[PDB]
A paper describes a structure:
In Mycobacterium tuberculosis the multifunctional heme enzyme KatG is indispensable for activation of isoniazid (INH), a first-line pro-drug for treatment of tuberculosis. The homodimeric structure is predominantly α-helical with each protomer (∼80 kDa) composed of two domains. The N-terminal domain contains a heme b and substrate binding site, which are essential for enzymatic function. A covalently linked “MYW catalytic triad” is formed by the conserved residues, Met255, Tyr229, and Trp107, which is essential for catalase activity (Jakopitsch et al., 2003, 2004; Santoni et al., 2004).
For the W107R variant, the best class produced a cryo-EM map to 3.3 Å resolution. This model surprisingly displays only one heme bound per homodimer of protein. The heme is absent from protomer A and displays significant structural disorder in the vicinity of the heme binding site. Several areas surrounding the heme pocket were difficult to model in protomer A, either displaying minimal or fragmented density (inset). In contrast, the C-terminal domain of both protomers remains similar to the WT KatG. The resolution of the map is sufficient to enable an Arg residue to be modeled in place of Trp107 in protomer B, resulting in disruption of the covalently linked catalytic triad. The remaining residues within the heme site are superposable with the WT protein. The W107R variant is predicted to disrupt the MYW catalytic triad in the distal heme site. The titration reveals a stoichiometry of 1:1 (W107R:H2O2) with no further spectral changes, implying that the W107R variant retains peroxidase activity but not catalase activity. For the W107R variant, the as-purified cryo-EM structure also revealed heme absence and disorder in regions associated with heme binding.
Author numbering:
A (entry chain A): 39 to 128, 138 to 193, 240 to 270, 325 to 346, 376 to 739
B (entry chain B): 39 to 196, 230 to 276, 282 to 356, 362 to 368, 373 to 739
Amino acid sequence: WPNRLNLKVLHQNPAVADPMGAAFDYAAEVATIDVDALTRDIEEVMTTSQPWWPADYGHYGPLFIRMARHAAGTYRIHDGRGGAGGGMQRNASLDKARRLLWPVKKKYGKKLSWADLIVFAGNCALESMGFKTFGFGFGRVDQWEPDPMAAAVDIRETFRRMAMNDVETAALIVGGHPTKWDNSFLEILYGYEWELTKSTMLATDLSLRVDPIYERITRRWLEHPEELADEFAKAWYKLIHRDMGPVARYLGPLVPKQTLLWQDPVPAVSHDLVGEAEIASLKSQIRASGLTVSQLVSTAWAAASSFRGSDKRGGANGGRIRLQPQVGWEVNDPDGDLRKVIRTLEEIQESFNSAAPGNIKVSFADLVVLGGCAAIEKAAKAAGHNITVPFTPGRTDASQEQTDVESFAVLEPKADGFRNYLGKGNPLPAEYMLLDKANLLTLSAPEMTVLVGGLRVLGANYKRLPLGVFTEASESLTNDFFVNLLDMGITWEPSPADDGTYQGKDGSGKVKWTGSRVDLVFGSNSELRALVEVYGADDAQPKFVQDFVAAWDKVMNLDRFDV
Amino acid sequence: WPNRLNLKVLHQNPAVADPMGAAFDYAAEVATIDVDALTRDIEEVMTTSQPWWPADYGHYGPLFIRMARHAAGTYRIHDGRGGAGGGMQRFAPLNSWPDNASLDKARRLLWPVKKKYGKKLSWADLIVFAGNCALESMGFKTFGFGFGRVDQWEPDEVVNPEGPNGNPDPMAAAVDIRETFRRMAMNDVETAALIVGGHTFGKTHDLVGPEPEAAPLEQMGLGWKSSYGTGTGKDAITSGIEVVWTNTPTKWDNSFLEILYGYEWELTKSPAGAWQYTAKGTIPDPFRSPTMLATDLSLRVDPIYERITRRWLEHPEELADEFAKAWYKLIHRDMGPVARYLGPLVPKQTLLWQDPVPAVSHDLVGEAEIASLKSQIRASGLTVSQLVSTAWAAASSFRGSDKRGGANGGRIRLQPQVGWEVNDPDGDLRKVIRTLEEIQESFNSAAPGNIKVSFADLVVLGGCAAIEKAAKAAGHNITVPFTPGRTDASQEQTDVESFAVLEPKADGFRNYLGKGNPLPAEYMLLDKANLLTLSAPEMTVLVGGLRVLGANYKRLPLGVFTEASESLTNDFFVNLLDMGITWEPSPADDGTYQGKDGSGKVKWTGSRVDLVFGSNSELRALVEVYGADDAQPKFVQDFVAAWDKVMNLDRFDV
Ligand code: HEM
């Protein structure tokens, strides 16, 4: 029970339990919402008072604000999950505000999900208390399954765990007071008699007065409330929109044109895109250039594995692998063959852009994935079967100033199972971290198994370790990993030099393979051996290739939201 | 469960964790394998001895027979879950019991066969076929076999060998054996046949390792790795008994009987464990006095088993027949109607426990003549409530974990079904049946050609016509799909005993709640919706439709949140989420809540199952979909789809 590797965490939100069907997109519907008519309904609900729960001060504004803040106050950067865009099992007194909004959800039904309705109720409450917010973006599909200086540091830490700076933390604290700039929160907390303490009576937020950096931050706002009104606008925006993905995922006509630093923005498509006859002119140009299949697949997977299917940030778009925060990570081994791949895939970019049919310019963030797909095509063609990996271009390269080291320092994988990376600070073993990594990328069990089996053989291993590889000749996409694992002629033992690896004796005289910990799980766990026995049969060689191509393509197209 | 209804049971084994894909039907694959090639592969795998698990007598056959038994010996009738066709004797919850010890090394011996076919031979099928072919290879003309037990890639959530926990008394063990074989619907003669002819093949076998559930990963999913001796073979420890029954453990003959009836069987103690019976003879060693267990020796003292066994001592052909029939019943117990047995080995003769529905003997009606039957049904005075209740009662006695029951056969008129409590036999069922029979007679006497309708079709046809009429009265001009091809089976083709288990002790779709149920009504409704293979939205829409239609037990008001009955509308959903009413447990406290409509009026009335949808946090998210202002057509379409899912659920011919 406790130590059982549960595969149920992969199909956590299936399509069988969705009451909407397969053919149902949340992007063609909320764009048709007339927010000018929805705000009237929200105003009516805010003004009225229902008898089953009386209206505090005859107004539901503050309740909606607290519901919105509490719904988007459970975000955590280390894992990404939580936030507002999720299901989060939609306290007690804050589970009735979800049922005080039914008169609005009833008029729309499917064109306005709860995850949008609650947060929009909060934002409209802010706009009704006399505040000019920054904007709003719909499109949060909801899952269908579940003393001062002693607390001052705690406040600075709790917000620091929610990707919140110091000035923005102060803005969020002061804004909640609710935000109407009439109660004069900071206007009295700084000009009041100090004999009135715990020992009118103030609250326990006296940290804002006594903490040095907090007091310095609030000194500006004491005499310049306009900067407070502007800083709370960005703080609220960040609070309710941290969970959602790139800027291209924002819907509705209320979204503001001004792009921010924390969205991880990328430049728009300032040119034409590469056609179909031209990508075949690049694939044959990607090879015959020096790069083998190992380097190309490692580079391509190293830029699209940073995705996080919880807050939908990271991914292959933008092409930040060439930039600073990721070309320095240990898993993307910088002193190895990464500074050479990056330089090689820029001469091709320069050469192609020089001699191009007009203005058909391709970006580096596109060339990296194109090189990966060309490498897989070559590897497959070297193993009998031939296949063309499908491709959806349109990525753009982001400059150094668009990204941010501090925000990207959390995306560093503490352990990457598909590449046998295992650093330090690993409480869980290497199997559960593989499961979590596959859950973040929105991978299903067959997809996870086929991806591991393909990546081991292809060459994507940390520092090209001989671990995992169960093939007599690499640089060829075969199912030889599954066949040699399900094979029962070998005998597995813990390694003599005990460091977490294993050793597969061939039974008779010698040692053939050298396994690992995130590898023998597939050969041991029955629920995964059931899939290994499917991909490692006699006839199912083409099935493995087709499934690997499909899973690879879906992983690469994970973060493609504009198309 | 203590609390927190687990709606993850309604979608277990989904189409996501399924490597084969979506467009893959097993019945179109296994019907093409050369079964002779499969036999020549299995009969060769059970001969070459692997070095990591040496074969006793150089013949794995008995191990395969034991594996086949233990794979289908977990089938329990009282719910139908578990057994052969499931395939869960391979996943974690079942490969860790001490009973199924050394039954994983057995399941890995068949890999050199499964790999040769890959996807045209399921594991849950290959295990049982390997058992049957091992039985065949030792000189035993078995009854038959039928492929088509699809594997499932996710574990679902569903006897001592010495006596009642340390009491080697055949008097004590005999009753336990009889009960644990009643639990699988076995008779007494069939139980004796299984115990005798299953232990004629093979032999039995502290300081062992952990189960594969918690074994080290270098074991490769195995377990129970013993350190005594070489560990595997000639010292193998799997049940710690070390008994050899038959004179030749690799050949079929009645040598069990003369041994168990030509000795006196003193009591001894095994090296590992204890409590085995020994005579006060010589059996060839795999690589010894005649010994017997306590359960096996129970067949010599129990008077009920005494007559059967001592008669089998004189005429062995009776044993040769009864064991074959019992084995056939065992491995095919939970695979379903005879229409699912595909493969060139299926027998032609039918059996009573198969619940046989006779084959059609007339031209089936078309989708051009049913426009007259639907008119006649709706023009016969029968209300929508009666037709819907009859149709649901016909198609609610189905078990998706056992594939038995269902609408086909037309049992709703025969004895075991018409007399149950949930589908009242007082004026409700006994009146609809007469009118339906009259209508079928009128149609058949005036048929165009040889086209003839069967009564088993008319119950579903009347249900469909009633639903169409209700939807037309609500304001939608839809038509409900219907596929004919059902037949009516006579009374002597229905085992009255075998349907007593099918009686629904609690049916959440009709507010029926009897006695003896452990869990409350909500969990019973969840289990019912799991048996019919219904997802959460399908269950919600079915409940919401059946409440308003009027298919309650005794047509009680407990759940009809509508003042306009006989009208298929979502009024059960919009009025449930009406937060302007306040609920209150009734002073009678009979489990029937009631909603005081604002001031003092007790307008509605509910039940513990009709209020879960408005209380459970994750199950209200579905009610809030169909309860919107515009999702009336969506609700109607989803209800029709779920109704077709329930009606055409046992149809395997189509
Ligand atoms: C309550 C009923 C039964 C009990 C308690 C029982 C008990 C046992 C035990 C303790 C073993 C020793 C396992 C080992 O050492 O590997 C065994 C083996 C065996 N059983 Fe049963 N048994 C029962 C019914 C059956 C049935 C119905 C069959 C039908 C085929 C069967 C077939 C076998 C065979 C073939 C073996 C030989 C296994 C081998 O050679 O490794 N038994 N049984």
